């Protein structure tokens, strides 16, 4: 219960430092997606606007709140008020929209949606049990509002069939947000402990060596650790070169000293679980859209069936490799075992990752067809199930966040393409421009903070590892001389 405490005590400044990025993303959020609210949707003004400058002010409040030294005692319960706070709006939000000028598209509130559950799932640091249920409670208030709330003047109510399996598009790609939001918490929690401990250790190591260093001639770091790190702003790249390439090689001799996995925290492991996901985020969201043909009783295009199964296919393979690779079964062959060696690189991993983030991104673009603009409801899915392949880009944290966000910035630019070629449909190009600029402006901060966490993590490794060598050798000459 002490480490809890003192851990809580040392990481408080990063929970401080992201805390006040949400208040500034919160606030820069609310200064543009308001400010269409008040153009293309100028008949009302007094339900939408209103609130949006409202909360700018709270954020800066809050953001004052954060520099006093109450903060830093309820810096838990600061961040459950502004969840409150931010939970209640935009889910009020979705509701007082609700002529055709004065409807929001159901993908602008799922914009919404999706950062606000990921600033819960990343930035608040609130505790995991209350988290879950917080992201959930927002999610299931949010798709039981617009179907109570739902403006038939402006959106046509399809078919009475169609409702009820649509109803599991709404409940499927929110569980694929919290199934990313749960991973992405749950790494993060993971490597900010880990890297404690092997600072801990690293300190305990460095003043053990003092004490063992007299017994052979007679014969505040740690909050700059994780506020000055050593690593460049810029490419995120280590400040040290012969460490960069060590980063760079780190995951592939572990492969091949087969080394046993003790926690979450190893690279086998974080890439086992991080290919489980993709392949879940993958046959979750590809489960959501062929369950619309089936209401639409229209067959699927054999191009959407056919990358599918090379899809599944290159999602089984790589799934069944990285068990393999964690678990290591004992009739596998030297020359599978130099393969798996070479997957391990950094450049393979790289154009393999490449691959398996954006297979659920590609699986969303493969149903687009030239009758894109026969119903309007195909758009609004395609777009809904666009941002939560966006979203799957912050997974994969081992590959570098400018490869991985700007991936998913030429994905979320695929549903643009599409609709200045399609180019109501005029409004709803621009707000889908804002609902992927502020969502691609979360994926480029979030990423690059988990690829800083998680380099931390490495350099935690060894700077753990290089003093507890030092021990050895040292213990060695020591007892010799003894």
Same mark, same amino acid.
């Given at each position: 219960?002490?480490?809890?405490?003192?851990?809580?005590?040392?990481?408080?400044?990063?929970?401080?430092?992201?805390?006040?990025?949400?208040?500034?993303?919160?606030?820069?959020?609310?200064?543009?997606?308001?400010?269409?609210?008040?153009?293309?949707?100028?008949?009302?003004?007094?339900?939408?606007?209103?609130?949006?400058?409202?909360?700018?002010?709270?954020?800066?409040?809050?953001?004052?709140?954060?520099?006093?030294?109450?903060?830093?005692?309820?810096?838990?319960?600061?961040?459950?008020?502004?969840?409150?706070?931010?939970?209640?709006?935009?889910?009020?939000?979705?509701?007082?929209?609700?002529?055709?000028?004065?409807?929001?598209?159901?993908?602008?509130?799922?914009?919404?949606?999706?950062?606000?559950?990921?600033?819960?799932?990343?930035?608040?640091?609130?505790?995991?049990?209350?988290?879950?249920?917080?992201?959930?409670?927002?999610?299931?208030?949010?798709?039981?509002?617009?179907?109570?709330?739902?403006?038939?003047?402006?959106?046509?109510?399809? /078919?009475?069939?169609?409702?009820?399996?649509?109803?599991?598009?709404?409940?499927?790609?929110?569980?694929?947000?919290?199934?990313?939001?749960?991973?992405?918490?749950?790494?993060?929690?993971?490597?900010?402990?880990?890297?404690?401990?092997?600072? /801990?250790?690293?300190?305990?190591?460095?003043?053990?060596?003092?004490?063992?260093?007299?017994?052979?001639?007679?014969?505040?770091?740690?909050?700059?650790?994780?506020?000055?790190?050593?690593?460049?702003?810029?490419?995120?790249?280590?400040?040290?070169?012969?460490?960069?390439?060590?980063?760079?090689?780190?995951?592939?001799?572990?492969?091949?000293?087969?080394?046993?996995?003790?926690?979450?925290?190893?690279?086998?492991?974080?890439?086992?679980?991080?290919?489980?996901?993709?392949?879940?985020?993958?046959?979750?969201?590809?489960?959501?859209?062929?369950?619309?043909?089936?209401?639409?009783?229209?067959?699927?295009?054999?191009?959407?069936?056919?990358? %599918?199964?090379?899809?599944?296919?290159?999602?089984?393979?790589?799934?069944?490799?990285?068990?393999?690779?964690?678990?290591?079964?004992?009739?596998?062959?030297?020359?599978?075992?130099?393969?798996?060696?070479?997957?391990? /690189?950094?450049?393979?991993?790289?154009?393999?990752?490449?691959?398996?983030?954006?297979?659920?991104?590609?699986?969303?673009?493969?149903?687009?067809?030239?009758?894109?603009?026969?119903?309007?409801?195909?758009?609004?899915?395609?777009?809904?199930?666009?941002?939560?392949?966006?979203?799957?880009?912050?997974?994969?944290?081992?590959?570098?966040?400018?490869?991985?966000?700007?991936?998913?910035?030429?994905?979320?630019?695929?549903?643009?393409?599409?609709?200045?070629?399609?180019?109501?449909?005029?409004?709803?190009?621009?707000?889908?421009?804002?609902?992927?600029?502020?969502?691609?402006?979360?994926?480029?901060?979030?990423?690059?903070? %988990?690829?800083?966490?998680?380099?931390?993590?490495?350099? /935690?490794?060894?700077?753990?590892?290089?003093?507890?060598?030092?021990?050895?050798?040292?213990?060695?000459?020591?007892?010799?001389?003894?």
């Amino acid at each position: 219960v002490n480490l809890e405490e003192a851990c809580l005590e040392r990481c408080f400044p990063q929970t401080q430092r992201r805390f006040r990025y949400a208040l500034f993303y919160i606030g820069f959020a609310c200064l543009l997606w308001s400010i269409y609210f008040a153009v293309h949707m100028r008949s009302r003004l007094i339900v939408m606007v209103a609130p949006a400058l409202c909360f700018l002010l709270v954020c800066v409040g809050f953001f004052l709140f954060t520099f006093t030294k109450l903060y830093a005692r309820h810096y838990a319960w600061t961040s459950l008020a502004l969840t409150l706070l931010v939970f209640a709006l935009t889910l009020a939000a979705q509701f007082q929209v609700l002529p055709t000028d004065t409807c929001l598209s159901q993908v602008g509130s799922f914009s919404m949606c999706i950062e606000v559950l990921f600033l819960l799932y990343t930035v608040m640091h609130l505790p995991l049990y209350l988290s879950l249920c917080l992201g959930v409670a927002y999610s299931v208030l949010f798709e039981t509002f617009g179907y109570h709330f739902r403006d038939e003047a402006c959106f046509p109510s399809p /078919g009475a069939g169609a409702l009820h399996w649509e109803l599991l598009s709404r409940g499927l790609l929110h569980g694929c947000i919290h199934a990313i939001g749960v991973h992405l918490f749950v790494m993060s929690q993971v490597r900010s402990r880990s890297t404690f401990l092997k600072v /801990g250790q690293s300190i305990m190591h460095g003043k053990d060596l003092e004490v063992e260093k007299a017994l052979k001639e007679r014969m505040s770091l740690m909050k700059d650790y994780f506020f000055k790190p050593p690593i460049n702003q810029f490419s995120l790249n280590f400040l040290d070169q012969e460490l960069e390439r060590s980063y760079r090689t780190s995951y592939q001799e572990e492969v091949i000293k087969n080394s046993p996995v003790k926690t979450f925290a190893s690279p086998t492991f974080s890439s086992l679980l991080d290919v489980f996901l993709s392949t879940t985020v993958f046959l979750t969201l590809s489960t959501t859209c062929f369950l619309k043909y089936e209401a639409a009783t229209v067959p699927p295009p054999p191009a959407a069936l056919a990358v %599918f199964s090379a899809a599944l296919l290159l999602e089984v393979l790589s799934l069944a490799v990285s068990i393999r690779m964690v678990f290591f079964l004992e009739d596998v062959m030297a020359c599978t075992k130099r393969l798996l060696e070479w997957i391990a /690189g950094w450049l393979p991993r790289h154009c393999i990752g490449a691959i398996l983030v954006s297979l659920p991104a590609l699986a969303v673009y493969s149903h687009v067809t030239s009758e894109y603009e026969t119903n309007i409801h195909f758009p609004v899915f395609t777009g809904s199930a666009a941002l939560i392949a966006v979203v799957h880009y912050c997974n994969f944290c081992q590959l570098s966040s400018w490869m991985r966000s700007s991936l998913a910035t030429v994905v979320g630019a695929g549903p643009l393409l599409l609709l200045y070629v399609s180019l109501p449909a005029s409004l709803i190009g621009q707000e889908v421009v804002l609902v992927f600029f502020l969502l691609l402006l979360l994926v480029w901060f979030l990423n690059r903070e %988990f690829e800083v966490s998680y380099r931390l993590h490495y350099h /935690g490794d060894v700077e753990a590892d290089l003093h507890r060598t030092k021990i050895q050798s040292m213990r060695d000459q020591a007892d010799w001389l003894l």
